[PDB]
Amino acid sequence: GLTRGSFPEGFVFGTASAAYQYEGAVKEDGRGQTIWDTFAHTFGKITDFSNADVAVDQYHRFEEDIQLMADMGMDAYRFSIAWSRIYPNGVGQVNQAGIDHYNKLIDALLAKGIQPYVTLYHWDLPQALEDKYKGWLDRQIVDDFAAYAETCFREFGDRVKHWITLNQPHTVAIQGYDAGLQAPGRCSVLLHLYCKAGNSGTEPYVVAHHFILAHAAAASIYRTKYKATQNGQLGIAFDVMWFEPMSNTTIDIEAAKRAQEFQLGWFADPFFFGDYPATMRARVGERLPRFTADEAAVVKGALDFVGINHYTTYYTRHNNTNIIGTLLNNTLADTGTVSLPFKNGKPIGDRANSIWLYIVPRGMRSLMNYVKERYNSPPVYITENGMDDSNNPFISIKDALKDSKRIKYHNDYLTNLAASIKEDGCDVRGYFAWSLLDNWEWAAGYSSRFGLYFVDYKDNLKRYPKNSVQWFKALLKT
Ligand SMILES: *[C@H]1O[C@H](CO)[C@@H](O)[C@H](O)[C@H]1O
To answer: Disulfide connectivity?
Structure first.
């Protein structure tokens, strides 16, 4: 089967995590409140009434967790820095204890021969910026994020050589500002009554625009002041479902392409070509911001690599609607498509625990080829890929460890990835499994177990290896 030999020399294997989902210690060492602290402590927002105040306590347990990575022979660990641990109020006074913590984490990883791949922003905006100017909705976020990024480059970039500025800006724009299912939970209240404020037709495009500009501002700083002496690289992690046409007809083929342009192209077309996709300009019109000439010049080419967070593939059909007033405008209607994991009464594949996560290994290879062809073969890392078990209190821990479905998922998606590189010529440089440990899965709380290690929430967060731990250890053998 698969071995390191199935991938290019030097191909990087790792696991991925995110600060708010893993760290806990939410009030420790001067940490500022974030929009997710506020959101997880608001009624109705988290399905199982939980929060990540303690999470899996990686803030105190990182050395134990690093040994768990080393036990499998991982090359790398993707983690995020909590902005509010560095600047508790977003800007202003730096929190030395935050710098000190992440230095300890980085040094502990390197002491075990594990390379740090660091995400600057994994959704945990300091609440002080949300309060001051509504965070990503205001242009001020661009300069504030860039200053925060600069502090990280300055403090950590002598050791950190792979930076991911932003995690899934598409997810944040849609879930935070169209559906209102993730922090800050804004949307058109006429579409979804649970939201307090927002506009599903306009706010997602503003937020996305500011993410793109924020990346380019940090990248400009990195390139001008840090990159020559640090010799590192910067990218972004895009959430990308693969889309297949719901029928092999010209109208549904164009629909799947359009759905992809509204998902990945929304962000990637600016970074490679200096403007949004034409289809978005045509359909979103004046609700889609325009780059200035000077902005386009800083935005185009601002990525060193493309991070791809990929789980699943849906079918996409053309959709005709031409009335939502303005009052019901939303991003899905804007696409002119509907995407679903069902065709002619049949699901596209087996499903993991998450209701959205269909197991479709071929989509990994199809997406690698799409990125290669559309964007002229940029370097790509799979910055997130994996699947979840339920959190099932009616079975024993021993039965919860038998994650044969996860093994087959990683086997099949990795086989497809290996082929995209070897047969198709895709420039993929590494792969990061979501996730090292079971953790707090945003609005799903503790109901979803994505970990290679099982976490016993009822026994002081004890970590147990699922079967997939041995499978990865065997894969990564030298
Ligand atoms: C990628 O998706 C996983 C699973 O939904 C999530 O936990 C991460 O935060 C995200 O980056």
So the answer is: 187-195
Nearest CA to ligand 1 atom 9: 18
Domain limits for position 27: 1-478
Q: Find the CATH number of the domain harbouring 125.
A: 3.20.20.80
How far is the centre of ligand 1, averaged over its atoms, from the C-alpha of 282 (Å)?
31
Please give the resolution of this entry in Å, rounded to 1 decimal: 2.0
Measured from the CB, is residue 441 less than 6 Å from ligand 1?
yes
Q: What is the 3-state secondary structure (H, E, C) of the chain?
A: CCCHHHCCCCCEEEEECCHHHHCCCCCHHHCCCEHHHHHHCCCCCCCCCCCCCCCCCHHHHHHHHHHHHHHHCCCEEEEECCHHHHCCCCCCCCCHHHHHHHHHHHHHHHHCCCEEEEEEECCCCEHHHHHHHCHHHCCHHHHHHHHHHHHHHHHHCCCCCEEEEEECHHHHHHHHHCCCCCCCCCCCCCCCCCCCCCCCCCHHHHHHHHHHHHHHHHHHHHHHHHHHHHCCEEEEEEECCEEEECCCCHHHHHHHHHHHHHHHHHHHHHHHHCCCCHHHHHHHHHHCCCCCHHHHHHHCCCCCEEEEECCCEEEEEECCCCCCCCCCCCHHHHHCEEEECEECCEECCCECCCCCCECCCHHHHHHHHHHHHHCCCCCEEEEEECCCEECCCCCCHHHHCCCHHHHHHHHHHHHHHHHHHHCCCCCEEEEEEECCECCCCHHHHHHEECCCEEEECCCCCEEEECHHHHHHHHHCCC
